[PDB]
């Protein structure tokens, strides 16, 4: 319990999770500045009424949102390359303590392997994995055509963060390699614009196709 | 002396053609159809084939000492349609965006006073 | 001084008096609670409050009902109101409501009743 | 990444087939068309004064025909 108590006491001087006080983090992209919540809070969970708020999603801490879209990562119409990515062994849904633990472990992994602020690594990955154009089928008189469309900063945040989560799930699913290791590997790849990540790859895919729909 | 050429942008509902010629229009410089840039015949008139081909012809003209261009928009004319295809505007924007100084942008569709009977028969193209 | 706290189904009764600083849930030290997330949830009000308040008052809170996390949040509400009534200064109230709202408003949300046509899986659940 | 951020000012109205595309007016904050106002679409929720990133400034949406 000694690491548990020491991590209890370390953030006594107001630190996100246990460590990595958020003052040193810098957002490079101007689009996501007024949406990524950088308020210093010990625990990334508010149980808040953000869904019933139209714009209450900007208040949620990026790490709380991270745990949020981690817990939902299982099972989908997404048969991406013909795979059903379900969590059958103690699924992440509703077990936010286990998800809390897994993000803690992946954050420690990021800290050690990158030797810098894991929150800042995540910030860079979010900037690097957000697409900038999507496609919409707009019709006049029943003659549909695919038109490139600009993406809102918040939708960009949503789609990119879901993409990295799905990349982590694709990595860990049906492999010895744990979930925390998958998430750490995916986030470091997305941090440096590595195409090997699902997040940056599908950012590129979303940018493309819409590229040709002009 | 700043060099100005002529960019004939023909646009039907099936294809678009961008032809760059000297100030007299007597010598050919760059002539790129929709067919150059796509692989489905249905795609030839689309604005993307238009702007891609237009930019290609534009850089080719730039490489050959061309800077300014007068646009000449053309519908099929004659007894055939008179509205330029959807790709003409896209191609004009592309020529602007390829680093060409745009001057007069007019229509040169030959409008007849009293032309031949058009095609299709008396009861029209009964789609 | 007496205080109470409501959350979900875990209800907390808290009593704060002068003391060295010991804070107890069910008469147990707050540092040795097995879940750590519940520990931070219980701990949130007195971090930002300060160490002098921590070591100037003894607080005993007993929580019954609900889940362990709900127990943590109810203890959070109870201790928040405890410091509120013991200190009774505006600035702590202002920063309490600035950090979040729950500890001065509670979470009056509950679980809606289940409805037939596959009630078991949830209220809004149904078959295929 | 040759992108150009721009600032939303006014919202023209819900557009596209399903209304999930929103038409707004944006002022180009940096680039060859600084200060120019363009009608641009937004997928996903938007507000006044959002910084939207463009790949091409030249592209434009047709006026919403009622």
What string of H, E and C letters represents the secondary structure of A7-70? HHHHHHHCCCCCCCCHHHCCCCCCCCCCCCECCCCCCCCCCCCCCCCCCHHHCCEHHHHHHHHH
Tokens of A158: 């949503």
* B61 touches B69 (CB < 8 A): yes
In this structure, the strands spanning D51-54 and D4-15 are antiparallel
How far apart are the C-alpha atoms of D63 and D41, rounded to whole Å? 11
B77 min Cα distance to partner chain A (Å): 25
Angle in degrees, CA C86, C89, C90, rounded to 5: 140
* A166 touches A73 (CB < 8 A): yes
C17 forms bridges with which residues in the sheet?
A: C58
* Residue A72 touches partner C, C-beta closer than 8 Å: no
User: B-D interface: how many C-beta pairs under 8 angstroms?
Assistant: 4
How far apart are the C-alpha atoms of B25 and C37, rounded to whole Å? 79
* A83 touches A60 (CB < 8 A): no
Angle between the N-to-C axes of helices A198-210 and A179-191, in degrees from 0 to 180, rounded to the nearest 10: 50
A148 min Cα distance to partner chain C (Å): 37
Q: What is the dihedral of CA C37, C39, C45, C46, to 10 degrees?
A: -140
Q: What is the Cα A37 distance to its own chain's centre? A: 14
How far apart are the C-alpha atoms of A106 and A66, rounded to whole Å? 12
Q: Is C13 helix (H, G, I), strand (E, B) or coil?
A: strand
Contacts of A124 (CB under 8 A, 6+ apart): A28, A191, A192
Angle in degrees, CA A25, A26, A28, rounded to 5: 150
How far apart are the C-alpha atoms of D21 and C60, rounded to whole Å? 55
Q: Is B127 helix (H, G, I), strand (E, B) or coil?
A: coil
User: Strand order in D37-43's β-sheet?
Assistant: D37-43, D21-28, D4-15, D51-54
Question: How many CB atoms sit inside 10 A of residue D3's CB?
Answer: 16
Instruction: Measure Cα distances from D64 to A154, B95, D12, D22 in Å.
Output: 24, 26, 8, 11
- Nearest-CB residue to A46 (from C31, C43, C100): C100
How far apart are the C-alpha atoms of D36 and D25, rounded to whole Å? 10
Rg over CA atoms, chain A: 18
How far apart are the C-alpha atoms of B92 and B72, rounded to whole Å? 10
Burial class (CB in 10 A: 0-12, 13-18, 19+), A176: exposed
Q: Return phi, psi of residue C102, to 5°.
A: -55, -45
How far apart are the C-alpha atoms of A73 and A86, rounded to whole Å? 8
Three state DSSP letters for B42-77: HHCCCHHHHHHHHHHHHHHHHHCCCCEEEEEEECCC
User: Strand order in B101-107's β-sheet?
Assistant: B28-33, B16-21, B4-11, B68-74, B101-107
Contacts of A186 (CB under 8 A, 6+ apart): A164, A167, A168, A171, A197, A198, A199
Tokens of A207: 């940018």
Tokens of B103: 């001057």
How far apart are the C-alpha atoms of B16 and B75, rounded to whole Å? 10
Closest alpha carbon to B71 in B36, B99, B107, B45: B107
* Residue A78 touches partner C, C-beta closer than 8 Å: no
How far apart are the C-alpha atoms of B21 and B60, rounded to whole Å? 12
Burial A43-77 (b: 16+ CB within 10 A, else e): bbbebbebeeeeeebbebbbbbbbbbebbbbbeee
* A139 touches A145 (CB < 8 A): yes
How far apart are the C-alpha atoms of B6 and B10, rounded to whole Å? 12
DSSP at D64? P
How far apart are the C-alpha atoms of A158 and A112, rounded to whole Å? 27
Tokens of A178: 């744990």
Residues from chain A contacting residue D47 (CB–CB below 8 Å): 55
* A130 touches D41 (CB < 8 A): no
Residues from chain A contacting residue B90 (CB–CB below 8 Å): 214
Residue showing tokens 């702590």: C92
Task: Note whether A152 contacts D44, CB cutoff 8 Å.
Answer: yes
- Nearest-CB residue to A150 (from D16, D20, D40): D40
* A72 touches A93 (CB < 8 A): yes
C76 min Cα distance to partner chain A (Å): 13
Helices (H) and strands (E) in chain D, counts: 0, 4
Task: Note whether A47 contacts C73, CB cutoff 8 Å.
Answer: yes
Angle in degrees, CA A23, A25, A29, rounded to 5: 135
Burial class (CB in 10 A: 0-12, 13-18, 19+), A6: exposed
Contacts of C52 (CB under 8 A, 6+ apart): none
Interface test with A, best of D22, D28, D51, D58 (most A CBs within 10 A): D51
Angle in degrees, CA D16, D18, D23, rounded to 5: 35
Tokens of A58: 């900007």
Burial A135-155 (b: 16+ CB within 10 A, else e): bbebeeeeeeeebbbbbbbbb
A148 forms bridges with which residues in the sheet?
A: A135
Closest alpha carbon to C67 in C5, C7, C10, C4: C10
Residues from chain A contacting residue D63 (CB–CB below 8 Å): none
Angle in degrees, CA D27, A56, C122, rounded to 5: 135
- Where do the H-state alpha helices sit in A115-197? 118-128, 153-172, 179-191
* B66 touches B100 (CB < 8 A): yes
D13 forms bridges with which residues in the sheet?
A: D23
Q: Is A166 helix (H, G, I), strand (E, B) or coil?
A: helix
C16 min Cα distance to partner chain A (Å): 22
Closest alpha carbon to B80 in B17, B6, B11: B11
Burial A99-128 (b: 16+ CB within 10 A, else e): bbebbbbbbbbbbeebeebbbbbbbbbbbb
Contacts of A61 (CB under 8 A, 6+ apart): A16, A37, A39, A41, A44, A46
* A70 touches A87 (CB < 8 A): no
D43 forms bridges with which residues in the sheet?
A: A151, D21
* C45 touches C79 (CB < 8 A): yes
**Residue positions counted in chain D:** 66
* C10 touches C70 (CB < 8 A): yes
Angle in degrees, CA B23, B24, B28, rounded to 5: 85
- Where do the H-state alpha helices sit in chain C? 36-49, 51-56, 68-87, 90-99, 102-105
Closest alpha carbon to C54 in A9, A208, A17, A183: A9
């Amino acid at each position: 319990a000694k690491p548990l108590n020491e991590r209890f006491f370390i953030p006594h001087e107001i630190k996100v999770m246990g460590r990595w006080s958020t003052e040193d983090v810098e957002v490079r992209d101007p689009s996501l500045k007024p949406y990524i919540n950088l308020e210093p809070r010990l625990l990334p969970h508010t149980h808040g009424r953000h869904a019933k708020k139209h714009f209450g999603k900007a208040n949620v801490h990026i790490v709380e949102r991270l745990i949020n879209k981690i817990m939902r990562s299982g099972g989908s119409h997404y048969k991406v390359a013909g795979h059903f990515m379900r969590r059958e062994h103690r699924s992440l849904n509703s077990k936010k303590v286990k998800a809390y633990e897994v993000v803690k472990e992946a954050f420690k992994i990021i800290e050690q392997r990158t030797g810098k602020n894991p929150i800042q690594v995540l910030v860079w990955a979010i900037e690097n994995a957000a697409p900038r154009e999507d496609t919409t089928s707009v019709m006049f008189g029943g003659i549909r055509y695919h038109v490139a469309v600009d993406i809102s900063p918040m939708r960009r945040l949503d789609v990119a963060l879901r993409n990295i989560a799905l990349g982590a799930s694709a990595k860990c699913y049906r492999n010895k390699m744990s979930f925390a290791e998958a998430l750490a590997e995916e986030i470091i790849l997305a941090a440096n614009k590595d195409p090997k990540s699902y997040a940056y790859s599908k950012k590129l895919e979303i940018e493309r196709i819409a590229e040709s729909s002009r | 002396k700043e060099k100005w050429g002529i960019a004939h942008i023909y646009s039907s509902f099936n294809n678009t053609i961008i032809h760059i010629t000297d100030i007299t229009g007597a010598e050919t410089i760059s002539r790129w159809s929709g067919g150059m840039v796509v692989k489905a015949d249905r795609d030839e008139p689309s604005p993307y084939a238009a702007m891609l081909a237009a930019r290609r012809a534009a850089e080719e003209a730039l490489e050959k000492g061309i800077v300014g261009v007068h646009i000449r928009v053309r519908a099929p004319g004659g007894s055939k349609s008179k509205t330029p295809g959807p790709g003409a505007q896209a191609a004009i924007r592309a020529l602007a965006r390829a680093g060409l100084k745009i001057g007069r942008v007019e229509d040169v569709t030959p409008i007849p006073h009293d032309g031949t009977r058009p095609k299709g028969g008396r009861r029209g193209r009964r789609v | 001084i007496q205080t109470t706290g409501k959350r979900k189904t875990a209800i907390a009764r808290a009593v704060i008096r002068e003391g060295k600083g010991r804070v107890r849930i069910n008469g147990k030290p707050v540092e040795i609670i097995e879940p750590e997330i519940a520990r931070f949830t219980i701990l949130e009000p007195l971090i930002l409050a300060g160490e002098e308040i921590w070591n100037s008052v003894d607080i005993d809170v007993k929580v019954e009902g609900g889940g362990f996390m709900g127990q943590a949040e109810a203890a959070r509400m109870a201790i928040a109101r405890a410091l509120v009534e013991w200190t009774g200064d505006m600035s702590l109230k202002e920063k309490f409501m600035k950090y979040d709202r729950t500890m001065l408003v509670g979470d009056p949300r509950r679980t809606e009743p289940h409805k037939p046509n596959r009630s078991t899986k949830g209220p809004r659940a149904k078959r295929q | 990444d040759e992108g150009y951020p721009a600032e939303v000012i006014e919202i023209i109205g819900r557009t596209g087939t399903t209304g999930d595309v929103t038409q707004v007016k944006v002022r180009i904050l940096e680039g060859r068309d600084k200060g120019r106002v363009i009608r641009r679409n937004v997928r996903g929720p938007v507000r006044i004064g959002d910084i939207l990133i463009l790949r091409e400034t030249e592209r434009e949406a047709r006026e919403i025909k009622s």
